[PDB]
Amino acid sequence: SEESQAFQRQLTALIGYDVTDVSNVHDDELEFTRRGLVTPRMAEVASRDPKLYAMHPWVTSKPLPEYLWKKIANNCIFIVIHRSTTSQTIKVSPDDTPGAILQSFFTKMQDFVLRVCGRDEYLVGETPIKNFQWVRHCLKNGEEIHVVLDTPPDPALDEVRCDRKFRVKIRGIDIPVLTVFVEANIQHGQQVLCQRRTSPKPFTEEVLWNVWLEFSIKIKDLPKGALLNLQIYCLYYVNLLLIDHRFLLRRGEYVLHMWQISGFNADKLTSATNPDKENSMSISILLDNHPIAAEMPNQLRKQLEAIIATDPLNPLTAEDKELLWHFRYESLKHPKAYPKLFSSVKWGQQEIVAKTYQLLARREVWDQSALDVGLTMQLLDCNFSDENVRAIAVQKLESLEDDDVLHYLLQLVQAVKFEPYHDSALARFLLKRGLRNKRIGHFLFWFLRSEIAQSRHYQQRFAVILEAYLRGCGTAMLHDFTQQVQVIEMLQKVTLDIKSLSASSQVISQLKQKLENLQLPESFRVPYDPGLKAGALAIEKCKVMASKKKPLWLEFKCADPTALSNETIGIIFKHGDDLRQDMLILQILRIMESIWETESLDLCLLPYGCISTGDKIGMIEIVKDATTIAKIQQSFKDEVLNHWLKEKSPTEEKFQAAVERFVYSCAGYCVATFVLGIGDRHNDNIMITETGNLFHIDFGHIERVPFVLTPDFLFVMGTSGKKTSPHFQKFQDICVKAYLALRHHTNLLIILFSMMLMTGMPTSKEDIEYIRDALTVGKNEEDAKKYFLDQIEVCRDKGWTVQFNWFLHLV
Ligand SMILES: Nc1cc(C(F)(F)F)c(-c2nc(N3CCOCC3)nc(N3CC(CO)(CCl)C3)n2)cn1
């Protein structure tokens, strides 16, 4: 169809990659997955309620935290309602359903719905008012809930239209420009089954061996998902699945173009070949050589328990693995032992694998066990290639409500890189949950699109998954995405053009002019906050920041007239940094906020919105009324920070609340940063709001100091490096309370941290340990409770020693 060709082009401009192209495939894995990602799509699309899908209500089935209970005194909630400059307040009970509120309101005077004023956010569905996120947001922030009664959005325009051994031939290598040898492996889950090599020849434009590298593994022994790893060093690598998606073995000859090093990493596992054929190193290989689906003594059981108890970081001895394996059925009764057990499997042996799959038959204990996202994630990392082991983990995620899928959505999207094949249980899980919820689908869009734009190694796999989502999300979503992408390209253009014109009066004139040139969509959704829409630019408020990379400071008008405030939406555009690192960290900070919601804690973290759009290019949310701690100091005497708060405080009451939130916010970042090992930062990278909320920024690429707690912060808490103030005791306990709450989620944090380094960093093995030592693994609470207080003292014993040094390095 002529219309289908123009439609596919819409998806191509949206996705930023052409899926129909078959220039860089040696097989049909991609296309087969497209055909295979039609059934799952239609299955979720044909099974979704248009009404609830069109308004995409954001809710949680979790209990309301202890601290958020104090906010409600009379067991009633105030819901200000709007129709046209008219206000009708309604005192309401925490359990009052949105429907009841509609009739309970009309009585004081049922076709319409309560929409949040100035937002594409609705309060609809059989849910208590207390369970809506926008409601919990207002309580936490003291704001009141303003709502407008409007027609429920039309779901109409959401609609979609042998026993022989193995061998391989190393013919040679070829690079057009610029002692090197070949290294061939057979890997399953980053675990080497066998390794062969060649003879070192001098580095030149042409070096060939044509050697026959023989393997010890046998044809029926080869596990599904097994990769053929080919490497070269004196610095190039490529892979290829020994088994395709149809259970067929690799028959034929292959010319493969290789990736190069820039000096473990998610990229090293990719089954995709290098797109650039003009400059890349190539490999010559040929392959010519199907499948189907008494108890322990308590002394050994005690040893097995000790092994199960240890962390995910603790390596497994050959002694342990044999113990875990010989006692499979005792190990099966402990879900926490599944990662270590499946690591004890000889995947290079068909007879054992069969025992493995047979073992997975009766998963009575696994399927009944409470979901452990830390335990589930472990089965999804680089150390597991078995399609069925991963399937039981993805099976467990399905119980997750949309609320929790949002918290872990970024890590899940990244975990796709660890999948041996393009079509996986995980990729189908992401697709289902994306098509089932508009908010999940919105972020799934930008997460996929961030990788597709700056990742040569995986852009193909993600493009196919993004295409499968674009069809099925709806005609309405497609319009928004088109607008959003349209604006970001115009802004990124301006951002890049502005950056080059500077290493002034000249640039400031160039900015306003080029901004007046765009004058382009009338409105678009904010990528990091889909509820908000943006209008025309506040060109007068727009400016290039006095920062080293010349970042664009932009402000927009809100396109919603139903908004009480007149505030502009601020966004920063930056080409200097790699905002992928920032995304992961910020998302981990949100996960930390959730964990502290478990023990009923608020630390007032400010995980501002951040989205990577291209290569070292993206956007950051602007937190209103925030300034840098450094800027407060210059234009290092201690009392400065306190003068600022009282200055920005209209009343003495405002000041006290600003001091309170500072004690919490400071405590939150002190604990969070030290764990992630990013505690040592300069003043410029730590900001504060006029309302007392402290927060950090710029998380890309990171003597000594545990974390930042300078004398000015101490002074705002009223302590001169020796005494203990009333607020300081509050802070010093809050740190311990919050630090103990994270040790309880050690495995979850480690696995997240481990994945963040592999899929989001450029070795990899030793770097992970800091979070293990920081979390004080294998130590009682009190001894650990002191370890953190000792870390606080190292900040007191220090002062500006490193902070002054930081001032020295930049200059
Ligand atoms: N990777 C990055 C990059 C930046 C960058 F480019 F500097 F803007 C930031 C950043 N975020 C932020 N904030 C994000 C949250 O809302 C407040 C602004 N501010 C600032 N600036 C302080 C400034 C120079 O001194 C003028 Cl006020 C510019 N920088 C964070 N992470």
Coordinates of N, CA and C in Angstrom, one line a residue, residues 103-257:
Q103 N -20.6 12.1 42.8 CA -22.0 12.2 43.3 C -22.1 12.9 44.6
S104 N -21.2 12.7 45.5 CA -21.2 13.4 46.8 C -21.0 14.9 46.6
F105 N -20.4 15.2 45.4 CA -20.2 16.6 45.1 C -21.5 17.2 44.5
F106 N -22.0 16.5 43.5 CA -23.2 16.9 42.8 C -24.4 17.0 43.7
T107 N -24.4 16.3 44.8 CA -25.4 16.4 45.8 C -25.5 17.8 46.5
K108 N -24.3 18.3 46.7 CA -24.2 19.6 47.4 C -24.4 20.7 46.3
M109 N -25.5 20.8 45.7 CA -25.8 21.8 44.7 C -27.2 22.5 45.0
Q110 N -23.5 12.0 36.7 CA -22.4 11.1 36.8 C -21.8 10.7 35.4
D111 N -21.5 11.7 34.6 CA -21.0 11.5 33.3 C -19.5 12.0 33.1
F112 N -19.0 12.7 34.1 CA -17.7 13.4 34.0 C -16.7 12.8 35.0
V113 N -15.5 13.3 34.9 CA -14.4 12.8 35.7 C -13.5 13.9 36.2
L114 N -12.8 13.7 37.3 CA -11.9 14.6 38.0 C -10.5 14.6 37.3
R115 N -10.2 15.7 36.6 CA -8.9 15.8 36.0 C -8.0 16.8 36.8
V116 N -6.8 16.5 37.0 CA -5.9 17.4 37.7 C -5.7 18.7 36.9
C117 N -5.9 19.9 37.5 CA -5.8 21.1 36.8 C -4.4 21.4 36.3
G118 N -4.3 21.7 35.0 CA -3.1 22.0 34.4 C -2.2 20.8 34.0
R119 N -2.9 19.6 33.9 CA -2.2 18.4 33.7 C -3.0 17.4 32.8
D120 N -2.3 16.5 32.1 CA -3.0 15.4 31.5 C -3.0 14.2 32.5
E121 N -3.6 14.5 33.6 CA -3.7 13.5 34.7 C -5.1 13.4 35.3
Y122 N -5.7 12.2 35.3 CA -7.0 12.0 35.7 C -7.1 11.2 37.0
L123 N -8.2 11.4 37.8 CA -8.4 10.7 39.0 C -9.7 9.8 38.8
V124 N -9.5 8.7 38.1 CA -10.6 7.8 37.7 C -10.3 6.3 38.0
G125 N -11.3 5.5 38.2 CA -11.2 4.1 38.4 C -11.5 3.7 39.8
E126 N -11.8 2.4 40.0 CA -12.2 1.9 41.3 C -10.9 1.8 42.2
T127 N -10.5 3.0 42.7 CA -9.4 3.1 43.6 C -9.7 4.2 44.7
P128 N -9.2 4.0 45.9 CA -9.3 5.0 47.0 C -8.5 6.2 46.6
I129 N -9.0 7.4 47.0 CA -8.3 8.7 46.7 C -6.9 8.7 47.2
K130 N -6.6 8.0 48.4 CA -5.3 7.9 49.0 C -4.3 7.2 48.1
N131 N -4.8 6.4 47.2 CA -3.9 5.6 46.4 C -3.5 6.2 45.0
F132 N -4.0 7.4 44.8 CA -3.6 8.1 43.6 C -2.2 8.8 43.8
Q133 N -1.3 8.8 42.9 CA 0.0 9.3 43.1 C 0.0 10.9 43.2
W134 N -0.8 11.5 42.4 CA -0.9 13.0 42.4 C -1.4 13.4 43.8
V135 N -2.3 12.6 44.4 CA -2.8 12.9 45.8 C -1.7 12.8 46.8
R136 N -0.8 11.7 46.7 CA 0.2 11.5 47.6 C 1.3 12.5 47.5
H137 N 1.4 13.0 46.3 CA 2.4 14.1 45.9 C 2.1 15.4 46.6
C138 N 0.8 15.7 46.7 CA 0.4 16.9 47.3 C 0.5 16.9 48.8
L139 N 0.2 15.8 49.4 CA 0.3 15.6 50.9 C 1.8 15.7 51.3
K140 N 2.7 15.1 50.6 CA 4.1 15.1 50.8 C 4.6 16.6 50.7
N141 N 4.0 17.4 49.9 CA 4.5 18.7 49.6 C 3.6 19.8 50.1
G142 N 2.6 19.5 50.9 CA 1.7 20.4 51.6 C 0.7 21.1 50.6
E143 N 0.8 20.9 49.3 CA -0.1 21.5 48.4 C -1.5 21.0 48.5
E144 N -2.5 21.7 48.0 CA -3.8 21.2 48.0 C -4.2 20.7 46.6
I145 N -5.2 19.7 46.6 CA -5.6 19.0 45.4 C -6.6 19.8 44.6
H146 N -6.2 20.4 43.5 CA -7.1 21.1 42.6 C -7.5 20.3 41.4
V147 N -8.8 20.2 41.1 CA -9.3 19.3 40.1 C -10.4 20.0 39.2
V148 N -10.4 19.7 37.9 CA -11.4 20.3 37.1 C -12.3 19.2 36.5
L149 N -13.6 19.4 36.4 CA -14.5 18.4 35.9 C -14.7 18.6 34.4
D150 N -14.3 17.5 33.7 CA -14.3 17.6 32.2 C -14.8 16.3 31.6
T151 N -15.1 16.3 30.3 CA -15.5 15.1 29.6 C -14.3 14.1 29.5
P152 N -14.6 12.9 29.9 CA -13.6 11.8 29.7 C -13.1 11.7 28.2
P153 N -11.8 11.7 28.0 CA -11.2 11.8 26.7 C -11.7 10.6 25.8
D154 N -11.9 10.9 24.5 CA -12.4 10.0 23.6 C -11.4 8.9 23.2
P155 N -11.7 7.7 23.6 CA -10.9 6.5 23.3 C -11.0 6.1 21.8
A156 N -11.6 6.9 21.0 CA -11.7 6.7 19.6 C -10.4 6.8 18.9
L157 N -9.7 7.9 19.2 CA -8.5 8.2 18.5 C -7.2 7.7 19.2
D158 N -7.5 6.6 20.1 CA -6.4 5.8 20.7 C -6.3 4.6 19.8
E159 N -7.2 4.3 18.9 CA -7.3 3.1 18.2 C -6.0 2.9 17.2
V160 N -5.7 1.7 16.9 CA -4.6 1.4 16.0 C -5.1 0.9 14.7
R161 N -4.4 1.2 13.6 CA -4.8 0.8 12.3 C -4.6 -0.7 12.0
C162 N 24.1 -35.6 16.5 CA 25.5 -36.0 16.1 C 26.5 -35.9 17.3
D163 N 27.6 -36.6 17.2 CA 28.5 -36.6 18.3 C 29.9 -36.1 17.9
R164 N 30.0 -35.6 16.6 CA 31.3 -35.0 16.1 C 31.6 -33.8 16.9
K165 N 32.9 -33.4 16.9 CA 33.4 -32.2 17.6 C 33.3 -31.0 16.7
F166 N 33.6 -29.8 17.3 CA 33.4 -28.6 16.6 C 34.7 -27.9 16.2
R167 N 34.6 -27.2 15.1 CA 35.8 -26.5 14.5 C 35.4 -25.2 13.7
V168 N 36.3 -24.2 13.6 CA 36.0 -23.0 12.9 C 37.3 -22.5 12.2
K169 N 37.2 -21.9 11.0 CA 38.3 -21.5 10.2 C 38.7 -20.0 10.3
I170 N 39.9 -19.7 10.8 CA 40.4 -18.4 10.9 C 41.2 -18.0 9.7
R171 N 40.5 -17.5 8.7 CA 41.2 -17.2 7.4 C 42.1 -15.9 7.5
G172 N 41.6 -14.9 8.1 CA 42.4 -13.7 8.3 C 41.7 -12.4 8.6
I173 N 42.5 -11.4 8.8 CA 42.0 -10.1 9.2 C 42.4 -9.0 8.2
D174 N 41.6 -7.9 8.1 CA 41.9 -6.9 7.1 C 41.4 -5.5 7.6
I175 N 42.3 -4.6 7.8 CA 42.0 -3.2 8.1 C 42.8 -2.3 7.1
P176 N 42.1 -1.5 6.4 CA 42.6 -0.6 5.3 C 43.7 0.4 5.8
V177 N 43.7 0.7 7.1 CA 44.6 1.7 7.6 C 45.3 1.3 8.9
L178 N 46.3 2.1 9.3 CA 47.1 1.8 10.5 C 48.0 0.6 10.3
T179 N 52.8 -7.2 16.4 CA 52.5 -8.5 16.9 C 51.0 -8.6 17.2
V180 N 50.2 -9.2 16.4 CA 48.8 -9.4 16.7 C 48.3 -10.8 16.4
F181 N 47.5 -11.4 17.2 CA 47.0 -12.7 17.1 C 45.5 -12.8 17.3
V182 N 44.9 -13.9 16.8 CA 43.5 -14.2 16.9 C 43.2 -15.0 18.2
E183 N 42.0 -14.8 18.7 CA 41.5 -15.6 19.9 C 40.0 -15.9 19.8
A184 N 39.8 -17.2 19.6 CA 38.4 -17.7 19.4 C 37.9 -18.4 20.7
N185 N 36.7 -18.0 21.2 CA 36.1 -18.6 22.3 C 34.7 -19.2 22.1
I186 N 34.2 -20.1 23.0 CA 32.9 -20.5 22.9 C 32.2 -20.2 24.2
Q187 N 31.4 -19.2 24.3 CA 30.9 -18.6 25.5 C 29.4 -18.9 25.7
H188 N 29.0 -19.2 27.0 CA 27.6 -19.3 27.4 C 27.4 -18.5 28.7
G189 N 26.8 -17.3 28.6 CA 26.6 -16.5 29.8 C 27.9 -15.9 30.3
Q190 N 28.7 -15.5 29.3 CA 30.0 -14.9 29.6 C 31.0 -15.9 30.2
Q191 N 30.5 -17.1 30.3 CA 31.3 -18.2 30.8 C 31.9 -19.0 29.6
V192 N 33.3 -19.1 29.6 CA 34.0 -19.8 28.5 C 33.9 -21.3 28.6
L193 N 33.4 -21.9 27.5 CA 33.3 -23.4 27.4 C 34.6 -23.9 26.9
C194 N 35.2 -23.2 25.9 CA 36.5 -23.5 25.4 C 37.2 -22.3 24.7
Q195 N 38.5 -22.4 24.6 CA 39.3 -21.3 24.0 C 40.4 -21.8 23.1
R196 N 40.5 -21.2 21.9 CA 41.5 -21.5 20.9 C 42.3 -20.2 20.5
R197 N 43.4 -20.4 19.9 CA 44.2 -19.2 19.5 C 45.0 -19.4 18.2
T198 N 45.7 -18.4 17.8 CA 46.6 -18.5 16.7 C 48.1 -18.1 17.0
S199 N 48.9 -18.0 16.0 CA 50.3 -17.6 16.2 C 50.5 -16.1 15.9
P200 N 51.1 -15.4 16.8 CA 51.3 -14.0 16.7 C 52.1 -13.5 15.5
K201 N 51.5 -12.7 14.6 CA 52.2 -12.1 13.5 C 52.3 -10.6 13.7
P202 N 53.3 -10.0 13.0 CA 53.5 -8.5 13.2 C 52.3 -7.7 12.7
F203 N 52.0 -6.6 13.4 CA 50.8 -5.8 13.0 C 51.1 -5.1 11.6
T204 N 50.2 -5.4 10.7 CA 50.2 -4.8 9.4 C 48.8 -4.5 8.9
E205 N 48.7 -4.1 7.6 CA 47.4 -3.9 7.0 C 46.8 -5.2 6.6
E206 N 47.6 -6.2 6.5 CA 47.1 -7.6 6.2 C 47.9 -8.7 6.9
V207 N 47.2 -9.4 7.7 CA 47.8 -10.6 8.4 C 46.8 -11.7 8.4
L208 N 47.1 -12.8 7.7 CA 46.3 -14.0 7.7 C 47.0 -15.2 8.1
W209 N 46.2 -16.2 8.7 CA 46.7 -17.4 9.1 C 46.1 -18.6 8.4
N210 N 44.8 -18.6 8.2 CA 44.1 -19.7 7.7 C 44.3 -21.0 8.5
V211 N 44.2 -20.8 9.8 CA 44.4 -21.9 10.7 C 43.1 -22.6 11.1
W212 N 43.1 -23.9 11.3 CA 41.9 -24.7 11.7 C 41.9 -24.8 13.2
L213 N 41.1 -24.0 13.8 CA 40.9 -24.1 15.3 C 39.9 -25.1 15.7
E214 N 40.3 -26.2 16.3 CA 39.4 -27.3 16.7 C 38.9 -27.1 18.1
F215 N 37.7 -27.5 18.4 CA 37.1 -27.4 19.7 C 36.8 -28.8 20.3
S216 N 36.8 -28.9 21.7 CA 36.6 -30.1 22.4 C 35.1 -30.4 22.6
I217 N 34.3 -29.3 22.5 CA 32.8 -29.4 22.7 C 32.2 -30.2 21.5
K218 N 31.1 -30.9 21.8 CA 30.4 -31.7 20.8 C 29.1 -31.1 20.4
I219 N 28.6 -31.5 19.2 CA 27.4 -30.8 18.6 C 26.2 -30.9 19.4
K220 N 25.9 -32.0 20.0 CA 24.7 -32.2 20.9 C 25.0 -31.6 22.3
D221 N 26.2 -31.3 22.6 CA 26.6 -30.7 23.8 C 26.3 -29.2 23.8
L222 N 26.5 -28.5 22.7 CA 26.3 -27.1 22.5 C 24.9 -26.6 23.0
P223 N 24.9 -25.7 24.0 CA 23.7 -25.1 24.6 C 23.1 -24.0 23.7
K224 N 21.8 -23.9 23.7 CA 21.2 -22.8 23.0 C 21.6 -21.5 23.6
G225 N 21.9 -20.5 22.8 CA 22.4 -19.2 23.3 C 23.9 -19.1 23.3
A226 N 24.5 -20.2 23.0 CA 26.0 -20.3 22.9 C 26.5 -19.3 21.8
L227 N 27.4 -18.5 22.1 CA 28.0 -17.6 21.2 C 29.4 -17.9 20.8
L228 N 29.8 -17.6 19.5 CA 31.2 -17.8 19.1 C 31.9 -16.4 19.2
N229 N 32.7 -16.3 20.2 CA 33.5 -15.1 20.4 C 34.8 -15.0 19.7
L230 N 35.0 -14.1 18.8 CA 36.3 -13.9 18.1 C 37.0 -12.6 18.4
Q231 N 38.2 -12.7 18.9 CA 38.9 -11.5 19.3 C 40.3 -11.4 18.7
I232 N 40.9 -10.2 18.8 CA 42.3 -10.0 18.3 C 43.0 -9.0 19.1
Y233 N 44.2 -9.3 19.5 CA 45.0 -8.3 20.4 C 46.4 -8.3 20.0
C234 N 47.1 -7.3 20.3 CA 48.6 -7.2 20.1 C 49.4 -7.7 21.2
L235 N 42.8 -5.7 19.1 CA 41.9 -4.9 19.8 C 40.5 -4.7 19.1
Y236 N 40.0 -5.9 18.6 CA 38.8 -6.0 17.9 C 38.0 -7.2 18.3
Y237 N 36.7 -7.2 18.2 CA 35.9 -8.3 18.6 C 34.6 -8.4 17.8
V238 N 34.1 -9.6 17.6 CA 32.7 -9.8 17.1 C 32.2 -11.2 17.6
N239 N 30.9 -11.3 17.6 CA 30.2 -12.5 18.0 C 29.2 -13.1 17.0
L240 N 28.8 -14.3 17.2 CA 27.8 -14.9 16.3 C 27.2 -16.1 17.0
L241 N 25.9 -16.2 17.1 CA 25.2 -17.3 17.7 C 25.4 -18.6 16.9
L242 N 25.9 -19.6 17.6 CA 26.1 -20.9 17.0 C 24.7 -21.6 16.8
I243 N 23.7 -21.0 17.4 CA 22.3 -21.5 17.1 C 21.4 -20.3 16.8
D244 N 20.6 -20.4 15.7 CA 19.7 -19.3 15.4 C 18.3 -19.5 16.1
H245 N 17.4 -18.6 15.8 CA 16.1 -18.6 16.4 C 15.2 -19.8 16.1
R246 N 15.7 -20.6 15.1 CA 14.9 -21.8 14.6 C 15.6 -23.1 15.0
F247 N 16.5 -23.0 16.0 CA 17.1 -24.2 16.5 C 18.1 -24.8 15.5
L248 N 18.4 -24.1 14.5 CA 19.4 -24.6 13.5 C 20.8 -24.2 13.8
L249 N 21.8 -25.0 13.5 CA 23.2 -24.7 13.8 C 23.7 -23.9 12.6
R250 N 24.8 -23.2 12.9 CA 25.4 -22.3 11.9 C 26.1 -22.9 10.8
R251 N 25.4 -23.0 9.6 CA 26.0 -23.6 8.4 C 26.3 -22.5 7.4
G252 N 27.6 -22.4 7.0 CA 28.0 -21.5 5.9 C 29.3 -20.7 6.2
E253 N 29.5 -19.7 5.4 CA 30.7 -18.8 5.5 C 30.2 -17.4 5.9
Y254 N 31.0 -16.7 6.7 CA 30.6 -15.4 7.2 C 31.8 -14.4 7.2
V255 N 31.5 -13.2 6.6 CA 32.4 -12.1 6.7 C 31.9 -11.1 7.8
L256 N 32.6 -10.9 8.9 CA 32.1 -10.1 10.0 C 33.0 -8.9 10.3
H257 N 32.4 -7.8 10.3 CA 33.1 -6.5 10.6 C 33.1 -6.2 12.1

